[PDB]
Amino acid sequence: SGFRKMAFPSGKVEGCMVQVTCGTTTLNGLWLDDVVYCPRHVICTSEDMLNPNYEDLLIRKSNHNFLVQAGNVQLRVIGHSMQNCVLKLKVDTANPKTPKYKFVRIQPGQTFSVLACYNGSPSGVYQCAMRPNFTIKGSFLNGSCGSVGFNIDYDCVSFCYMHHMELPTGVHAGTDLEGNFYGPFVDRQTAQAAGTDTTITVNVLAWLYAAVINGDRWFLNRFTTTLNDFNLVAMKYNYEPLTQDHVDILGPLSAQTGIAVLDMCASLKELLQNGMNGRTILGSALLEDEFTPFDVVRQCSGVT
Amino acid sequence: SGFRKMAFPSGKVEGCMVQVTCGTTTLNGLWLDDVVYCPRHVICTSEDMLNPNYEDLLIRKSNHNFLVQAGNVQLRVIGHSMQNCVLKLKVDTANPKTPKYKFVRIQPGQTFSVLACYNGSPSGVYQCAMRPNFTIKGSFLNGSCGSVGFNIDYDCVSFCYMHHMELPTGVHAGTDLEGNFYGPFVDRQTAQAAGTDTTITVNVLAWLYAAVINGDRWFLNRFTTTLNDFNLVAMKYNYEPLTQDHVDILGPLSAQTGIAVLDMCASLKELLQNGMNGRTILGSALLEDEFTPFDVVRQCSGVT
Ligand SMILES: N#Cc1ccccc1C[C@@H](N)C(=O)N[C@H](Cc1ccc(Cl)cc1Cl)C(=O)N[C@H](CC(=O)NCCc1ccccc1)Cc1ccc(F)cc1
Ligand SMILES: N#Cc1ccccc1C[C@@H](N)C(=O)N[C@H](Cc1ccc(Cl)cc1Cl)C(=O)N[C@H](CC(=O)NCCc1ccccc1)Cc1ccc(F)cc1
Ligand SMILES: [Cl-]
Ligand SMILES: [Cl-]
Numbered sequence: 001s002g003f004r005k006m007a008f009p010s011g012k013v014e015g016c017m018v019q020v021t022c023g024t025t026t027l028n029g030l031w032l033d034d035v036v037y038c039p040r041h042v043i044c045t046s047e048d049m050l051n052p053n054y055e056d057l058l059i060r061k062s063n064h065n066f067l068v069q070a071g072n073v074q075l076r077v078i079g080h081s082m083q084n085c086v087l088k089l090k091v092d093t094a095n096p097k098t099p100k101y102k103f104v105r106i107q108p109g110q111t112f113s114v115l116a117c118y119n120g121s122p123s124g125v126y127q128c129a130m131r132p133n134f135t136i137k138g139s140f141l142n143g144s145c146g147s148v149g150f151n152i153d154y155d156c157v158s159f160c161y162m163h164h165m166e167l168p169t170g171v172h173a174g175t176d177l178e179g180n181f182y183g184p185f186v187d188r189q190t191a192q193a194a195g196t197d198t199t200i201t202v203n204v205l206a207w208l209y210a211a212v213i214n215g216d217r218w219f220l221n222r223f224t225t226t227l228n229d230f231n232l233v234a235m236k237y238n239y240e241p242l243t244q245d246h247v248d249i250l251g252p253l254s255a256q257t258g259i260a261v262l263d264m265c266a267s268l269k270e271l272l273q274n275g276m277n278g279r280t281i282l283g284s285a286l287l288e289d290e291f292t293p294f295d296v297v298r299q300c301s302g303v304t
Numbered sequence: 305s306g307f308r309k310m311a312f313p314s315g316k317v318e319g320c321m322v323q324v325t326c327g328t329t330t331l332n333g334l335w336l337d338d339v340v341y342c343p344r345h346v347i348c349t350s351e352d353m354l355n356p357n358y359e360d361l362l363i364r365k366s367n368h369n370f371l372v373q374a375g376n377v378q379l380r381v382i383g384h385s386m387q388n389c390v391l392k393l394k395v396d397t398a399n400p401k402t403p404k405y406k407f408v409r410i411q412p413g414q415t416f417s418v419l420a421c422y423n424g425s426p427s428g429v430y431q432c433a434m435r436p437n438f439t440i441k442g443s444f445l446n447g448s449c450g451s452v453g454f455n456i457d458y459d460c461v462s463f464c465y466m467h468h469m470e471l472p473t474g475v476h477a478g479t480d481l482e483g484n485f486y487g488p489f490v491d492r493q494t495a496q497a498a499g500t501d502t503t504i505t506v507n508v509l510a511w512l513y514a515a516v517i518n519g520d521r522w523f524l525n526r527f528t529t530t531l532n533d534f535n536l537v538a539m540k541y542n543y544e545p546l547t548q549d550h551v552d553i554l555g556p557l558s559a560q561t562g563i564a565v566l567d568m569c570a571s572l573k574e575l576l577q578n579g580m581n582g583r584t585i586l587g588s589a590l591l592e593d594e595f596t597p598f599d600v601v602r603q604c605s606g607v608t
Contacts, residue, residue, distance in 0.1 A: 001474040004443040006428040009419065011315025115313065124310040124603065125429060137587070139308040141605050170305040170518070214474070283441070285589035299428065301445050 001214050003282045005290075006299050007113035008152040010125045013159075015097030018075070019120030020089065020146070021067040028117040028146030029068065029089070030159070030177070032098050036068050036075070036089040037177060038146045039164050040082055041187050049189040058082055069120060070095075084179030085187045086162065101157040105176040108132045109200045109240070111292050112149040112160050119143060129290040130161075131171075132240060133197040134183025138163070138172040148177070167192055200289040201239045202246035205264055207288045209253035210296040211281050213304050218279060220259070223266040230265040237272045249293050257304055305518050307586045309594075310603050311417035312456040314429045317463075319401030322379070323424030324393065324450070325371040332421040332450030333372065333393070334463070334481070336402050340372050340379070340393040341481060342450045343468050344386055345491050353493040362386055373424060374399075388483030389491045390466065405461040409480040412436045413504045413544070415596050416453040416464050423447060433594040434465075435475075436544060437501040438487025442467070442476040452481070471496055504593040505543045506550035509568055511592045513557035514600040515585050517608050522583060524563070527570040534569040541576045553597050561608055 020029040020038045023045065029038035041049060043057050043065075061080070066089055068075040079090035106112065111129045115122050116139065128136045128149060140147070140163060149161030164174040164187050171194065173185040185192050208219070231241045247261045254261050268287075276285060324333040324342045327349065333342035345353060347361050347369075365384070370393055372379040383394035410416065415433045419426050420443065432440045432453060444451070444467060453465030468478040468491050475498065477489040489496050512523070535545045551565045558565050572591075580589060 001445075001470065002441060002443040002476070004430040004432075004441075005309050006420070006430045006443060007311060009315070009318050009426040009429055010313045011318040011426075014313050014315040116310070122313040122315075125313055126308040126310045128308075137306060137308075139306040139310060139603060141305075166305065172306070280590070286584070299443060 001301070003210050003214055003299065005127045006295070007125045007127050008150065010113065010115045010122065012099040012152065012155070012157050013115045013148065013150055014122045016095060016099070017115070017117050017120050017122055019069040021069070022061070022065055026119060027143065028120055030146070030148055030162070031068075031070060031075075031091070031095045032101060034091055034094040036077075036091055037162070038087050038089070039162065039175075039187065040085050040087040040179070041145075041164070042087060051190075052188055054082065058087075085164065085175050085181060086177065086179030099157045100155055101159060103177040104151075104158045104160045105178070105180065106130055106160045108134060109203060109292065110160075111290055111295055112151050114138060114149045114161070114163075115147060116140065116144055117147045127290065128161075129200060129203070129292075130182060131194075131197050132200065133195040134181075134185075135167065135171040135173055135194045135197070136161070140166060140172055165189075167194060169194070199237070199239045199287070201234055201242050202249060202293065203289040203291055204239075204268060204287045205242075205246075205250060205261070206253060206293040206296045207282065207291045208264055208268060209250070209257055209259070209293075210291065210300055212257045212259060213253075213296075213300045214282065216281060219267050219271055219281060221267055221270055223270070224260065224263045225266045225269060227262065227265075230262070230269060233269050233272060239272075253293055253296060256302070305605070307514050307518055307603065309431045310599070311429045311431050312454065314417065314419045314426065316403040316456065316459070316461050317419045317452065317454055318426045320399060320403070321419070321421050321424050321426055323373040324391075325373070326365070326369055330423060331447065332424055334450070334452055334466070335372075335374060335379075335395070335399045336405060338395055338398040340381075340395055341466070342391050342393070343466065343479075343491065344389050344391040344483070345449075345468070346391060355494075356492055358386065362391075389468065389479050389485060390481065390483030403461045404459055405463060407481040408455075408462045408464045409482070409484065410434055410464045412438060413507060413596065414464075415594055415599055416455050418442060418453045418465070418467075419451060420444065420448055421451045431594065432465075433504060433507070433596075434486060435498075435501050436504065437499040438485075438489075439471065439475040439477055439498045439501070440465070444470060444476055469493075471498060473498070503541070503543045503591070505538055505546050506553060506597065507593040507595055508543075508572060508591045509546075509550075509554060509565070510557060510597040510600045511586065511595045512568055512572060513554070513561055513563070513597075514595065514604055516561045516563060517557075517600075517604045518586065520585060523571050523575055523585060525571055525574055527574070528564065528567045529570045529573060531566065531569075534566070534573060537573050537576060543576075557597055557600060560606070
């Protein structure tokens with residue numbers, strides 16, 4: 001029993017982290033087979049960053065303008081290209097530690113593990129969700145750019161996030177591994193604002209089911225509600241509307257606990273209206289929304 | 305910026321996890337050089353577990369009674385011994401992935417990363433603290449026994465915990481890697497109760513400093529307090545007494561933020577007396593006590 005913020009084991013990704021240097025700029029890259037993937041703003045000086053023309057800046061670069069280091073071993077760059085906001089550096093050596101992997105672009109509300117890295121060296125791992133406003137509430141310092149987010153499924157690493165920048169509010173923005181930003185953001189050093197965020201309703205409900213699976217029942221009630229009535233309340237408290245697809249995704253948890261989804265929605269409605277009144281759920285004093293239904297199934301026992 | 309429950313990268317420990325089988329009993333072992341470390345109750349049947357005499361049970365075993373599997377490769381056991389509550393199995397093959405490592409027995413209040421494993425296969429990593437009552441609030445299912453907890457310092461893995469059992473309350477008990485339990489517990493299947501737990505005061509204070517470093521100041525006040533006056537309040541709210549050694553450990557954080565330790569104690573006193581009144585700190589609605597001063601320094605910027 002018990003319930004924790006749980007990341008995937010990071011070893012398969014640690015073996016892919018390298019350091020990329022262009023001029024005085026250094027950040028992290030991801031070394032898969034004979035290609036290194038990193039944020040394209042590695043080619044920018046501090047002055048370039050305010051308003052870069054990346055096509056202009058890249059045409060002025062050659063292969064020998066890029067330094068790639070794996071451990072204390074330099075990899076020779078033999079080719080380079082730009083794909084959206086990621087720079088690809090072809091190197092002369094295929095990574096012998098390359099895992100089975102895929103590149104995946106995720107939806108808001110999905111979670112992933114982040115391997116925070118500095119100068120090509122992994123320093124820690126944590127769990128994140130993609131917020132509905134396409135930021136993540138990461139933990140990142142200077143030098144973290146190029147750190148990646150991933151899920152693991154039967155020894156296949158699905159990479160879904162590469163870190164590019166911290167916004168004025170301190171949240172974080174980045175791209176899929178093909179260089180497309182999540183959200184409306186662009187890779188230049190200007191003050192960009194995320195849209196107003198919302199709470200991930202299907203995840204809160206998943207986490208309430210985790211609590212029941214762990215024997216925590218104090219918040220349940222005998223009431224139920226309709227989808228339309230619940231969504232009125234979701235709107236009032238800045239929760240994402242609950243869709244029928246999300247009701248269906250919660251099927252297995254509902255069946256393991258015998259609590260219909262719309263029953264749990266009535267408990268959540270009551271929690272939103274009355275607060276917790278000093279009690280906790282799974283050791284938390286607020287409603288947690290960064291566990292997906294998948295996360296709950298993965299971590300909890302298959303029997304309540 | 306940002307602040308997350310952050311574990312160490314787990315790769316160096318993943319390469320040491322194996323599966324140990326004795327009879328119908330299977331759990332996880334740790335393979336370092338040519339020795340596999342695992343809970344000694346792997347030699348127990350379900351009936352043996354209620355009241356085992358381990359010396360009696362082990363003398364009835366030979367080397368070929370133990371099956372060790374690393375991946376799909378069986379390791380041949382060539383010797384076995386008991387050290388307190390850990391079984392040591394000598395194998396014919398030294399682990400080529402053995403990291404630089406140490407065995408360390410930690411104090412309550414210290415944190416570590418846990419690599420949760422099933423059948424020798426790593427499934428997730430999370431952060432834990434050793435509670436003052438010598439349990440950990442882990443996330444563990446059947447088959448997790450033999451999972452280890454660790455810290456990493458400059459590529460040296462310090463192993464500090466091996467998982468042995470879940471108590472009736474759902475918290476977890478285990479040993480150092482020399483097989484000595486943390487706390488008063490013993491490895492037999494009886495209902496054992498932990499002592500009443502307390503909040504880790506020095507860690508709460510560390511986490512308040514993390515919040516200030518991240519620009520979160522709403523809880524500060526102009527007051528200060530004495531060590532003796534603070535400890536009166538700590539007693540009232542079931543907090544560990546603050547020692548002068550803990551005041552000293554908080555030195556660097558106090559100096560980076562310009563807030564004297566005893567000043568922060570006055571803020572904590574006010575937080576305990578008045579609650580949060582609906583506000584959050586580092587995204588939490590309760591006072592978090594599973595970040596050490598070291599954890600905060602490691603994760604936060606060196607400049608406020
Ligand atoms: N992670 C990360 C990271 C963090 C710090 C330094 C460096 C890095 C990595 C580094 N790589 C990077 O992200 N640097 C961007 C600048 C940048 C580079 C490159 C690109 Cl392409 C785009 C950008 Cl925006 C960066 O400094 N942002 C700051 C960070 C900041 O002051 N937070 C305060 C939050 C806060 C705290 C308390 C209270 C309220 C708020 C915010 C900002 C300011 C002006 C601006 F115009 C745009 C953004
Ligand atoms: N992790 C782990 C784990 C978890 C489940 C199954 C298996 C394992 C690993 C496995 N290895 C292991 O720990 N099994 C011990 C039994 C055991 C084996 C070997 C030794 Cl040496 C010692 C022990 Cl005690 C185990 O089943 N404990 C149960 C677990 C339980 O019912 N929690 C409910 C909490 C709860 C939930 C909701 C509300 C309130 C409370 C509690 C218990 C019951 C009777 C008793 F007498 C002693 C302990
Ligand atoms: Cl798709
Ligand atoms: Cl010591």
